[PDB]
DNA sequence: ATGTACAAACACACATCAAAGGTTTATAGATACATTGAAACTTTTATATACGCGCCTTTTTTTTTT
């Protein structure tokens, strides 16, 4: 509602029917011919020079970049919406498609492309010279201010004001769209629904949140601080929040943890206003304050963070703020002095708000921040946008769709993010558990899946292989119930939820730079803390449907957060896939976007040498049939 | 429809901190011997003088067995 779904929907514009091709225009003109109606991308015989052409292709659709002449392409509806930042000559892309009119030129698609170039940069929501107003700016969304009632009748005929930009400032459209068809000064009351009304009245309107163009502020408790540096993937995001008129903001999809505070530093530094920051959990947040927050540009003293047990200095500093949603994303609240903090900052006209990895966060709890801050601008930072909660209003119509993707196979040609060759070992199955798996019921069937004799024979082989060629391991699995049994039946450490803080320390200290106790297991809450800077030998064993997304996201921090820049980087991933079992199809459906990312995958049902393992307990299958007798228990508890 | 493993509050059961105190003992006060050198102390005598007292020495009296 306030936000819009439009941030997780790539792979579109595929305009082609049972008779798509028109009289091949590019048939004669063969310098370049992408799939037009689709928006697909394909080179032409009068034109093979590719590498420099990365950017032009970046404007449209999805490639196949292990393609030879070129990679693939596609149309994208909101994709043109993103392109407005440059906002170049619209027909030029069509003019570029002029040669690329491969079939008879799909003017309809071209119009669709002209349409594909309709919204972004054609935004419409008024603003005024140190205030906000009820007008509109570009053709794509112009009326998204003027004809309105929360933007038009919620646009107030006030003439013009920077100093007069405050009383109203039908709430602060300080982040209004492109502005000023006759712009009626914006008010102070009711856009918390406008953001909902927007797509409700479906205005593809390009929000704009300025750098100094709202003098409801003698611009407030920030200031520019640029000390930072840049790896090859920054600047676009930074200038991505400028546009036309006055500045703006948006949403960006990233493998996070890359000093994303630093990019957060800039835009906040570049508005000098009131801003707050948010992260998941005192479980999660502390990987932020002090190894990647001070090599940067901020003074050492200001901010406060709040848990009323992990509390700070509140009622104290005029400067900026930082908190957690789930803290107040709920009627959860520890010390009523929280409501000594709650009321203002909630009610406070924050210039900007920072939300981070809201991906897992549900509307059923995510709407609180929507109902909490309503800051004049917002930060969009999560893991993945194609989702399971693909529901109606994603945070876009609040902030925007994804602004910057990542880049993996050919920009990382500046910085190698950990060359991957994924492995899935296709271990067959025995009916012995499986027979009563044919007798099972609700997901307590899946426990039987965990009862596979094959995992063991391979499990050590993985440990053996890794150390037979001598590189240490990081493993992935689930369902601790017996997976914990696996651990100290693997000769390897056990890790489990519902665990005291004390014991968490003994895991790493005489363990990291040592070279002997070189194996690890993972829980379902421990993954919410950290992964080692070591052992990119990545082995999946056990997972679970739906979690697949975050499970796949869970795999992310290992490699992408790594940045070392060697020649090859012979790194690999591995996984356990017990054959003839309920999940692998869903795992293939999980695999369905594995090499989507270009980070590839190779399969081995059996390698050269899996059986080389003589230390496996249950070497003969009667212990595996002893296992059957233990296999009963929990599934006889079940 | 439909509730379930999973992890955030939210106030609390759990491991920790800290004041108090018997007991031990160097550690020191005070202690009782251990040293020794040092000066305050002893001896002749004879010599008469003019004493006693006890002891040299002896005269007179005093007391058991055949």
Curated annotation (Swiss-Prot):
- The chain positions of domain Helicase ATP-binding read 241-403
Q: Where does ATP bind?
A: 254-261
Q: Indicate whether Aminoacyl-tRNA synthetase appears among the record's keywords.
A: no
A cellular component term from Gene Ontology for this protein is:
nucleotide-excision repair factor 3 complex
Which cofactors are named for this entry?
Answer: Mg(2+)
The consequence of residue 260 to R is:
Lethal in vivo. Defective in translation in vitro
Query: Coordinates of motif DEAH box in the sequence?
Result: 356-359
Q: Which reaction is catalysed here?
A: Couples ATP hydrolysis with the unwinding of duplex DNA by translocating in the 3'-5' direction; ATP + H2O = ADP + phosphate + H(+)
A GO biological process of this protein is: transcription open complex formation at RNA polymerase II promoter
Question: Residue limits of the Helicase C-terminal domain?
Answer: 457-611
The pH profile of the activity is: Optimum pH is 7.25 for helicase and ATPase activities.
Q: Which residues carry this modification: Phosphoserine?
A: 620
Q: Does the keyword Iron apply?
A: no
Q: What is its EC number?
A: 5.6.2.4
The cellular location(s) given in this protein's UniProt record come to:
Nucleus
For this UniProt record, give its keywords in alphabetical order, as a comma-separated list.
ATP-binding, DNA damage, DNA repair, DNA-binding, Helicase, Hydrolase, Isomerase, Nucleotide-binding, Nucleus, Phosphoprotein, Transcription, Transcription regulation
A Gene Ontology molecular-function term?
A: DNA binding
Deletion phenotype:
Essential, it cannot be deleted; epistasis studies suggest it is involved in damaged DNA excision repair.
Summarize the protein's role. ATP-dependent DNA translocase. Component of the general transcription and DNA repair factor IIH (TFIIH) core complex. When complexed to CDK-activating kinase (CAK), involved in RNA transcription by RNA polymerase II. May have 3'-5' helicase activity alone, the TFIIH core however has no 3'-5' helicase activity. Also involved in transcription-coupled nucleotide excision repair (NER) of damaged DNA. In NER, TFIIH acts by opening DNA around the lesion to allow the excision of the damaged oligonucleotide and its replacement by a new DNA fragment.
The record describes its quaternary structure and partners as:
Component of the 7-subunit TFIIH core complex composed of XPB/SSL2, XPD/RAD3, SSL1, TFB1, TFB2, TFB4 and TFB5, which is active in NER. The core complex associates with the 3-subunit CTD-kinase module TFIIK composed of CCL1, KIN28 and TFB3 to form the 10-subunit holoenzyme (holo-TFIIH) active in transcription. An additionnal subunit, TFB6, plays a role in the dissociation of the SSL2 helicase from TFIIH after transcription initiation. Interacts directly with TFB6.
According to its UniProt record, which protein family does this protein belong to?
Answer: Belongs to the helicase family. RAD25/XPB subfamily.
Instruction: Recite the other comments.
Output: Present with 825 molecules/cell in log phase SD medium.
Q: What is this protein called?
A: General transcription and DNA repair factor IIH helicase/translocase subunit XPB/SSL2
From-to range in the entire protein, with total length: 101 to 770 of 843
């Amino acid at each position: 509602p306030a936000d819009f779904v439009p941030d997780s929907v790539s792979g579109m514009f595929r305009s082609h029917d049972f008779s798509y091709l028109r009289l091949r225009p590019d048939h004669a003109s063969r310098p370049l011919w992408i799939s037009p109606s689709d928006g697909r991308i394909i080179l032409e015989s009068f034109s093979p020079l590719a590498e420099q052409a990365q950017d032009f292709l970046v404007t449209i659709a999805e490639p196949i970049s292990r393609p030879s002449h070129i990679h693939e392409y596609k149309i994208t509806a909101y994709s043109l919406y993103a392109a407005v930042s440059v906002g170049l000559e619209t027909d030029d892309i069509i003019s570029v498609l002029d040669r690329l009119s491969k079939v008879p030129v799909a003017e309809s698609i071209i119009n669709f492309i002209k349409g594909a170039t309709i919204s972004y940069g054609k935004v419409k929501l008024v603003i005024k010279h140190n205030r906000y107003f009820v007008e509109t700016t570009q053709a794509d969304i112009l009326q998204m201010l003027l004809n309105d009632s929360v933007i038009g009748p919620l646009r107030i005929d006030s003439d013009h004001q920077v100093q007069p930009p405050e009383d109203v400032l039908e709430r602060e459209e300080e982040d209004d769209d492109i502005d000023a068809v006759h712009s009626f000064e914006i008010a102070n009351e009711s856009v918390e629904v406008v953001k909902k009304r927007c797509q409700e009245i479906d205005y593809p309107v390009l929000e704009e949140y300025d750098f100094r163009n709202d003098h409801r502020n003698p611009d407030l408790d920030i200031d520019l601080k640029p000390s930072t540096q840049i790896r090859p993937y920054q600047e676009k995001s930074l200038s991505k929040m400028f546009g036309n008129g006055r500045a703006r903001s948006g949403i960006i999809v990233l493998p996070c943890g890359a000093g994303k505070t630093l990019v957060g530093i800039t835009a906040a530094c570049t508005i000098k206003k009131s801003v707050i920051v948010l992260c998941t959990s005192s479980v999660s947040v502390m990987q932020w304050r002090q190894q990647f927050l001070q090599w940067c540009t901020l003074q050492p003293e200001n901010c406060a963070v709040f848990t009323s047990d992990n509390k700070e200095m509140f009622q104290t500093e005029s400067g900026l703020v930082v908190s957690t949603y789930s803290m107040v994303a709920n009627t959860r609240n520890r010390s009523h002095d929280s409501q000594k903090v709650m009321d203002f900052l909630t009610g406070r006209e924050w210039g900007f708000i920072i939300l981070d990895e809201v991906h897992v966060v549900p509307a059923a709890m995510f709407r609180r921040v929507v109902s909490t801050i309503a800051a004049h601008a917002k930060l969009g930072l999560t893991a993945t946008l194609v989702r399971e909660d693909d529901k109606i209003g994603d945070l876009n119509f609040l902030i925007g769709p994804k602004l910057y993707e990542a880049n993996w196979m050919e920009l990382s040609q500046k910085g190698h993010i950990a060359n991957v060759q994924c492995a899935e070992v296709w271990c067959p199955m025995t009916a012995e558990f499986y027979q009563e798996y044919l007798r099972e019921t609700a997901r307590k069937r899946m426990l039987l899946y965990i009862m596979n004799p094959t995992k063991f024979q391979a499990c050590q082989f993985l440990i053996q292989y890794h150390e037979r060629r001598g590189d240490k391991i990081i493993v992935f699995s689930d369902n601790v119930y017996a997976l914990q049994e696996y651990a100290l039946k693997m000769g390897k450490p056990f890790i489990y939820g519902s665990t005291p803080q004390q014991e968490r320390m003994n895991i790493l200290q005489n363990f990291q730079y040592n070279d002997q106790i070189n194996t690890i297991f993972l829980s379902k809450v421990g993954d919410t803390s950290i992964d080692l800077p070591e052992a990119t030998c990545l082995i999946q064993i056990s997972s679970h449907y739906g979690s697949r997304r975050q499970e796949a996201q869970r795999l992310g921090r290992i490699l992408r957060a790594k940045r070392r820049n060697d020649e090859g980087f012979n790194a690999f991933f591995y996984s356990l896939v017990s054959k003839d079992t309920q999940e692998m199809y869903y795992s293939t459906k999980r695999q369905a976007f594995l090499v989507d990312q270009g980070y590839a995958f190779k399969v081995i049902t059996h390698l050269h040498g899996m059986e080389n393992i003589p230390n496996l307990a249950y070497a003969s299958p009667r212990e595996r049939r002893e296992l059957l007798q233990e296999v009963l228990l929990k599934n006889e508890e079940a």
